Amino acid sequence: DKDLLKGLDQEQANEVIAVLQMHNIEANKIDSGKLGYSITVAEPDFTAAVYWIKTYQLPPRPRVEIAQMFPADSLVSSPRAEKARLYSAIEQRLEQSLQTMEGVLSARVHISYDIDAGENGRPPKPVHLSALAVYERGSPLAHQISDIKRFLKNSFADVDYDNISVVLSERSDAQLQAPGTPVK
């Protein structure tokens, strides 16, 4: 009934309703054509819903990787810019691959960017990398930690089993349950 967000694109609008129906208030993804989607909540829950817009900082910012800020359209693209979008595409591609393991729902991978190794006239640092992973319920999480940590060791040149930091966490409880319209 009461307007709460306007002009959202698609993947931002589907995330907000996922947050809201977690906290027991229903929303209505009203498309407004080329002016983006719109989310309207009922009047007794406009109070509670604008709280959860604040804490989760909804709508979500577009998920940024490093190579979006080195586009190389027609610029000469200095050798720092090549390793910037090189490793950034490797951050994305290892993320795409952990997501297709057994039971990993989602994943995030970061790479340590030793970039100025040639400019200082020094041998480069060892590559460090971090990983996040969301498993199912019921999986014994203390044993899939070894598969990931074995996997993306040899995805880089000089890493160890100490430069890999994987903190994997099982997913939340399933929201399968209808929130409910308020009473009159």
Partner 1 sequence: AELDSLLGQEKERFQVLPGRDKMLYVAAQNERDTLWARQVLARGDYDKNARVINENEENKRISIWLDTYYPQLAYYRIHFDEPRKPVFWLSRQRNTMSKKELEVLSQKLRALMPYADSVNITLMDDVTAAGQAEAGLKQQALPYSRRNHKGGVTFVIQGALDDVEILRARQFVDSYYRTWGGRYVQFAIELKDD
Task: Restricting to residues 23-52, name those near partner 1 by CB under 8 A.
Answer: 23-25, 44-45, 47-48
H helices then E strands: how many in the chain?
5, 6
Cβ at position 184, least distance to partner 1 in Å? 9
The span from the CA of 89 to the CA of 163, in Å, is: 20
How many binding residues for a second copy (CB under 8 A)? Answer: 111
Identify which range of 16-24, 28-36, 62-70, 82-90 contacts partner 1 by CB under 8 A: 16-24
> β-strands 129-135, 164-170: how paired?
parallel
How many binding residues for partner 1 (CB under 8 A)? Answer: 38
Q: Contacting a second copy (CB under 8 A), which of 1, 12, 42, 89?
A: 89
Q: Which of residues 128-157 bind a second copy (CB under 8 A)?
A: 128-130, 132, 134, 147, 150-157
Is the peptide bond prior to 179 cis by the omega test (within 30 degrees of 0)? no
For partner 1, the closer CB: 13 or 132: 132
Distant-in-sequence, close-in-space partners of 95: CB < 8 Å, separation ≥ 6: 107, 108, 109
